[PDB]
Design an enzyme around this catalytic site. Structure first.
Site, PDB file in Angstrom:
ATOM      1  N   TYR A 268     -21.016 -24.806  20.933  1.00  0.00           N
ATOM      2  CA  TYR A 268     -20.074 -25.909  20.961  1.00  0.00           C
ATOM      3  C   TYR A 268     -20.633 -27.175  20.298  1.00  0.00           C
ATOM      4  O   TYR A 268     -21.750 -27.592  20.585  1.00  0.00           O
ATOM      5  CB  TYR A 268     -19.699 -26.197  22.409  1.00  0.00           C
TER       6      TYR A 268
ATOM      7  N   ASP B 249     -27.958 -28.787  16.831  1.00  0.00           N
ATOM      8  CA  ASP B 249     -27.116 -29.607  17.674  1.00  0.00           C
ATOM      9  C   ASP B 249     -27.867 -29.709  19.002  1.00  0.00           C
ATOM     10  O   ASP B 249     -27.752 -28.839  19.863  1.00  0.00           O
ATOM     11  CB  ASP B 249     -25.759 -28.942  17.885  1.00  0.00           C
TER      12      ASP B 249
ATOM     13  N   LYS C 184     -25.580 -37.401  24.933  1.00  0.00           N
ATOM     14  CA  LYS C 184     -25.788 -37.330  26.370  1.00  0.00           C
ATOM     15  C   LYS C 184     -26.946 -38.154  26.954  1.00  0.00           C
ATOM     16  O   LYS C 184     -26.753 -39.313  27.324  1.00  0.00           O
ATOM     17  CB  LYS C 184     -25.883 -35.856  26.775  1.00  0.00           C
TER      18      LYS C 184
END
Ligand SMILES: Cc1ncc(COP(=O)(O)O)c(CNC(CN)CCC(=O)O)c1O
Ligand SMILES: *Cc1c(COP(=O)(O)O)cnc(C)c1O
Ligand SMILES: NC[C@@H](N)CCC(=O)O
Lengths: 427, 427
Positions: free
Chosen positions: A144, A239, A267
């Protein structure tokens, strides 16, 4: 155990927002459909609107590696918001953080901040194409990288939890330049380059998967993705939005010694605020406006608050014993969790790298999304609701990695292990 | 007037980030380069790293309509961060804000929060296509909806439907469905629907432009974009990221009484934090996951800090006299600014609506981007640097709308007018 107050509030949200949530997963559909409304979070715990207390393992999905509402982070924030919450212009703090990020992540010698993982990933995908001149891209099923058009095909998270396919609202023309492939499959990748000679700009992937449950790379897989990309003069993109500053200070690339051309972050570097970043190889970043022709902008980008939360967060993480402690307790929970399932006679496979883990209801071994999809979802459902009643908050999905923080004590680990034994026993 | 300390810091950022900034405009390239580094902002003022004080008219680009570091907003934030800066789950605050946004914006009966304008616009673009099933989209030259790939399409006569990517890194296939046309040109739009029957999902635009200088719609233009879209059963989308809660509580759609199908918001609703939102017609939003099939999700979306800053910000804006005051002083500056240029003998034009205004160094009048492009940029450059030395901070670009806040006093307006007279006089 009651959640009347959460039920009331959520019922009202369904009339105000789509699915009554700001993000799909929070809906709990794939685990019951009755999500719990939070009121506050402290250290390793979370508190209901009904007053229930939980040992949280979601950690707001990655940001709380130093624990919820960390004293020094909040203090650094209060003091900071006194000087304004956003300038819309350059500030010293951007430099500091940029520097820390550069020192931290190997491949990164020049970075650009954004506001979310999605922004970083859609921008890194663009720079990926702008630098090489090739349109096609290769990603792995289960991974993702945000809800950006190109990535919306064999995505993860929610679309890889409660059903949900590629598209809709995404032109076929879009997803065409996106080449998908099974995770941990070098050959599958080697073939995609043969079928599309001179057309593949590079490969993007999660150096360690967290969006299909916990999935780690096999020996030589990353090392291999680095050889084949170089071979075809294509970029290798990591990522590290989820893994960054969690699997290790320098992320997966530092721990497993594989250096990519570009890497995305998010994050944790926000310390609890909306933050993102894409950076890496100097000569590739120079294409980013206003240095290069590749346009990319952000209004609240590099804002004081976020730059502060991030600075303070990385500083706490530079302390000795940080990662050692995280891997220590995270190993206790994982082993202990798989130990408990073995006793209650439930097929399961776990694993973990630092304060990140996984637990699938299937024996495995799990190497890709397909393997992971064999998990007994009906089981996880009853298991998730179970833990909840025992005072444990777990990701409302089988396809979401678990997280721990520096705020999690030896007792919490033992208490989680206890409730797990209780739940599985009656599963 | 010196900026040694800012020069030092910026010189260092250029080695750390692309262009040494987190967003292109911040580099000051369209004003002779060498931007000023901020340290703090309060009410209507800004302070250098060299100690210079400025009467700010950028307002962090829109968020500061109640003034920088507003006492009640900061207080609401401190108190809030005590309970955590992000849960990663549902919370009562999302409901409150969703409600306020619903009551505020007419077209909006269901909303979804995101983290930036770019997220809102790229998601509204997707929902735009998913609901109608059509791929093509129409936007206006000069308008801005973020760096999502489909909006990175070359605009200008001779390339309207040519859908050419005005930036490297983005494939041709993507911008191909992006048809463009001159702002305030109903006929140009009427033709696009004729050339592409059954293929146009809808039209997106700034109900009032701010990204090409200040540009307001001509009579019947918006009312017209609403008739033609209905006629072809296509959606009308208002990007009120900049205008939302500034031109009026309910945005342009409330002031000029034109209701769209979908509308994007941002900036002000974040109160100084990264926030975004796209909402509107109930039956269209239901397609948004987990209610519908279209996928969109954000980790920070709906975080308590941002939801708090926004709640408190809208509350201050519901006070009596809010907009009346804003339009009052903003009218004083605009009229007075055009009055001064007329005296110093400068080709100039522009105007204002509520707390938003513009000022072009050209006779105009201005109705679109082309008209606006006739502005003497070399002039604005010397004018911008001039104001800076006189203690005025203006958007480092001719194509950026100006902003005022409730914190700007009659004196500030008079002092800005003063410095303007001084600067233009020596232009
Ligand atoms: C109508 C409209 N729609 C979308 C956007 C993009 O918003 P952000 O993603 O950058 O928050 C914007 C962004 N505006 C600015 C300032 N005018 C972005 C700041 C910059 O580019 O430096 C907008 O005005
Ligand atoms: C969480 C995650 C994202 C999504 O980031 P957002 O800020 O929600 O857009 C992207 N990539 C990875 C690897 C993630 O784990
Ligand atoms: N890997 C996916 C999660 N970070 C989802 C976060 C959210 O949408 O709230």
């Amino acid at each position: 155990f009651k959640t009347i107050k959460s039920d009331e509030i959520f019922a009202a949200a369904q009339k105000l927002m789509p699915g009554g949530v700001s993000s799909p997963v929070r809906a709990f559909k794939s685990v019951g459909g009755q999500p719990i409304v939070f009121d506050r979070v402290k250290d390793a715990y979370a508190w209901d609107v009904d007053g229930n207390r939980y040992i949280d393992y979601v950690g707001t999905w990655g940001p709380a590696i130093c624990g919820h509402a960390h004293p020094e982070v909040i203090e650094a924030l209060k003091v900071a918001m006194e000087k304004g919450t956003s300038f819309g212009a350059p500030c010293a703090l951007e430099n500091v953080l940029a520097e820390m990020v550069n020192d931290a992540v190997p491949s990164i010698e020049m970075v650009r901040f954004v506001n979310s993982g999605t922004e970083a990933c859609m921008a890194v995908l663009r720079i990926m194409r702008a630098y090489t001149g090739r349109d096609k891209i290769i990603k792995f099923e289960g991974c993702y990288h945000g809800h950006a058009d190109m990535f919306l095909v064999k995505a993860g998270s929610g679309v890889a939890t409660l059903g949900l396919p590629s598209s809709p609202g995404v032109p076929k023309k879009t997803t065409a330049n996106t080449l998908t492939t099974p995770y941990n499959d070098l050959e599958a990748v080697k073939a995609l380059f043969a079928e599309n000679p001179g057309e593949i700009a590079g490969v993007i992937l999660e150096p360690i998967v967290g969006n299909s449950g916990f999935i780690v790379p096999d020996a030589g897989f990353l090392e291999g993705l680095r050889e084949i990309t170089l071979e075809h003069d294509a970029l290798l993109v990591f990522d590290e939005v989820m893994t960054g500053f969690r699997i290790a200070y320098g992320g997966v690339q530092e721990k497993f010694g594989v250096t990519p051309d570009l890497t995305t972050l998010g994050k944790i570097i926000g310390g609890g605020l909306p933050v993102g970043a894409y950076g890496g190889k100097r000569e590739i970043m120079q294409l980013v406006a206003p240095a290069g022709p590749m346009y990319q902008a952000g209004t609240l980008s590099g804002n004081p608050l976020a730059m502060t939360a991030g600075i303070k967060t990385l500083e706490l993480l530079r302390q000795p014993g940080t990662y050692e402690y995280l891997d220590q307790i995270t190993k206790r929970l994982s082993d202990g969790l798989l130990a408990i399932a073995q006793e209650t006679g439930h097929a399961a496979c776990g694993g973990q790298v630092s304060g990140m883990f996984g637990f699938f209801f299937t024996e495995g071994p799990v190497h890709n999304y397909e393997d992971a999809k064999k998990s007994d979802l009906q089981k996880f459902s009853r298991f998730h609701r179970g833990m909840l009643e025992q005072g444990i908050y777990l990701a409302p999905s089988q396809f979401e990695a678990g997280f721990t923080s520096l705020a999690h004590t030896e007792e919490d680990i033992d208490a989680t292990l206890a409730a797990a034994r209780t739940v599985m026993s009656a599963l």
